[PDB]
Design a protein around this ligand. Structure first.
Ligand code: HEM
Ligand code: HEM
Ligand code: HEM
Ligand code: HEM
Length: 107
């Protein structure tokens, strides 16, 4: 069994790094993120060669690194997509979880 890394994983392929914590996501199945590939949950870095390596943010197909972290209507849920769903219409949760600035994700 794969073990979940500690907290404080820095995601830094772009100019706006974000910190991922496995602890605050304990209510999500590993599989909602480390999703099935060729019938089998894949645990390599999202941005691996042949995976979401398209660094062109005005690129909307399955390969886009920006797309998979922010887009709605994606087969598996993006960071922003699932957060929009958790926040509902609560203004405080929308700012912390879905805000583009001054949120838990981006300064
Ligand atoms: C519409 C709302 C948002 C805007 C406009 C925004 C904008 C951006 C931009 C411009 C970048 C850098 C992409 C590059 O230059 O190639 C980025 C990266 C990123 N954003 Fe956002 N962001 C938003 C909200 C959020 C939130 C709330 C989350 C998390 C739940 C988040 C997760 C990320 C991730 C994980 C990265 C990539 C980190 C890296 O590897 O450097 N974003 N975002
Ligand atoms: C016990 C539960 C889970 C397992 C076993 C697990 C395991 C892992 C492992 C082994 C890595 C490091 C991979 C690498 O850098 O080689 C990883 C990274 C990370 N995990 Fe998970 N995780 C689980 C749940 C989650 C969930 C629910 C999500 C989000 C809600 C998540 C999102 C990520 C992200 C985005 C990374 C960093 C990927 C990269 O740096 O590109 N994980 N986790
Ligand atoms: C934490 C890890 C990862 C994240 C956050 C992530 C995110 C996503 C999202 C949101 C989608 C749907 C895109 C859309 O519908 O347009 C997707 C699909 C896809 N991703 Fe990932 N991904 C990760 C890891 C991987 C890696 C390592 C691979 C390659 C082995 C991979 C290959 C694919 C493929 C092939 C698709 C289409 C899946 C299908 O059509 O069943 N993903 N991913
Ligand atoms: C790369 C992956 C994503 C990013 C970067 C990310 C970022 C984080 C952030 C920064 C927090 C606030 C707590 C802390 O700082 O750790 C958090 C909260 C959480 N996220 Fe994510 N998230 C991601 C994926 C998603 C997805 C895909 C889901 C589930 C499908 C989700 C569900 C939640 C929930 C339920 C919480 C707790 C909200 C509450 O305590 O306020 N997240 N996320």
């Amino acid at each position: 069994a794969p073990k979940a890394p500690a907290d404080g994983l820095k995601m830094e392929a772009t100019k706006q790094p974000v910190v991922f914590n496995h602890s605050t996501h304990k209510s999500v199945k590993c599989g909602d993120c480390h999703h099935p590939v060729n019938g089998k949950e894949d645990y390599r870095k999202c941005g691996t060669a042949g995976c979401h390596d398209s660094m062109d943010k005005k690129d909307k197909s399955a390969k886009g690194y920006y797309h998979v972290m922010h887009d709605k209507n994606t087969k598996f849920k993006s960071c922003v997509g699932c957060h929009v769903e958790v926040a509902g219409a609560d203004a405080a949760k929308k700012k912390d979880l879905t805000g583009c600035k001054k949120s838990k994700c981006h300064e």
